[PDB]
Amino acid sequence: DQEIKKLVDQNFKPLLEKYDVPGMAVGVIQNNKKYEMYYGLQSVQDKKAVNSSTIFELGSVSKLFTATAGGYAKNKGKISFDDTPGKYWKELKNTPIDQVNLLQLATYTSGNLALQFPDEVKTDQQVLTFFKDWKPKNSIGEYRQYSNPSIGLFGKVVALSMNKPFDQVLEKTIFPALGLKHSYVNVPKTQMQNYDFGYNQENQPIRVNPGPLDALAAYGVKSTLPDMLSFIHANLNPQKYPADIQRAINETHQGRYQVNTMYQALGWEEFSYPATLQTLLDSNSEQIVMKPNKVTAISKEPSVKMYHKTGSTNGFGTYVVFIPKENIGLVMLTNKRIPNEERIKAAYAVLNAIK
């Protein structure tokens, strides 16, 4: 009786006091039934409660939507994952980065792209110059190094293949196909009352830096708890959706290579299910997140899988996880970052008790 509420109150609610988080939204979906729990405030100053309309910055969870957009384009034949960027972004033809293919960009294996652009790369024109000046380092395809530039280039190519800027790819094609009505790249004026600053580690209000427009594909999406639960629902139960978006979602579930106990899918990290808590924590280790790691081609993909993704901005935290075989998933959104390990542990405690 009210198992989900009790588990969320036991495992997530104490994190607000522990880390002085102003507001948190936790959603659990089980057997196509969505449970939403909210704690605290969207705005400390205004005393406005965090609610089902509150818009949160997703940080790197934005990459799940870029991945879905790439899967959408690929299954309509608009791109091949074996293509290179210069086929679509013609000012990259005859450059060294035109030896990297789109799957390698989407899965962080170009061999010379770090977590962030250099600090001086602030505009899209500087982004293009950066890619023109790029030269290889490690063997292409061999090393995973988690990278915002890498995804940003993949998203730009996807947008070019769809004859629309990236913000419109998501806002006009992908979000509508998923039935998401309050997810945004650019939050409109009519929604600004629902989109407040997040809070930094000193509880000072802070908003994500726009960065060059190409970085929106890496970390620029904002969404609500009900929309994120709908997105999990689409990942668990795609048959309710348009065929082209079913194929896009399916594309993001296929493992592309292995690193230790993790499989890298498009956007999602993938694990054999059941996964130990330690396996899930290891996916967030400094070694995996910050360093190049040699990849291994998949022999046999696990027959039963689960998927997760963390994301943060300076003022927000996100965690999403789903388990097809159990028909369950969970989303956590906060307007202050908390350690990724706390998100993963709390979600593990909830989902493992509702099996």
Residue numbers in the entry: 5 to 359
Source paper text:
Class C Acinetobacter-derived cephalosporinases (ADCs) represent an important target for inhibition in the multidrug-resistant pathogen Acinetobacter baumannii. The class C Acinetobacter-derived cephalosporinases (ADCs) play a significant role in antibiotic resistance in A. baumannii. β-Lactamase-mediated resistance to β-lactams can be overcome using combination therapy involving a β-lactamase inhibitor coupled with a partner β-lactam antibiotic. Many ADC variants have emerged, and characterization of their structural and functional differences is essential. X-ray crystal structures of ADC variants in this study provide a structural context for substrate profile differences and show that the inhibitor adopts a similar conformation in all ADC variants, despite small changes near their active sites.
ADC-212 has a Pro219Leu mutation and also contains an alanine duplication of a couple of residues prior to Tyr221. In the apo X-ray crystal structures of the variants (resolutions ranging from 1.24–1.89 Å), the Ω-loop conformations show more variation than in the complexes. Two of the variants containing an Ala duplication, ADC-33 and ADC-212, begin to diverge in their trajectories starting at Ile209, with the most significant shift in the Cα position (3.4 Å) occurring at the sequence difference between the two: Arg213 in ADC-33 vs Pro213 in ADC-212. The Ω-loops of these variants come back into alignment at Leu216. In Adup variants ADC-33 and -212, residues Leu216 and Asp217 are extended out from the active site, as compared to ADC-7, -30 and -162. Despite sequence differences at positions 218a and 219 in ADC-33 (Ala218a, Pro219) and ADC-212 (Leu218a, Ala219), the structure is nearly identical, with negligible changes in corresponding Cα positions. However, these variants display subtle but noticeable shifts in the side chain of conserved residue Tyr221, as compared to variants without the Ala insertion. Overall, the B-factors of atoms in the Ω-loops are elevated more in the Adup variants, suggesting that the Ω-loop is more flexible in this region of the Adup variants: ADC-30 (loop 20.4 Å2; B monomer 21.0 Å2) and ADC-162 (loop 23.0 Å2; B monomer 22.3 Å2) vs ADC-33 (loop 20.8 Å2; B monomer 18.8 Å2) ADC-212 (loop 21.8 Å2, B monomer 19.7 Å2) ADC-219 (loop 41.4 Å2, B monomer 35.7 Å2). In ADC-212, residues Arg210, Val211, Asn212, and Pro213 all shift away from MB076 (Cα shifts 2.0–5.4 Å).
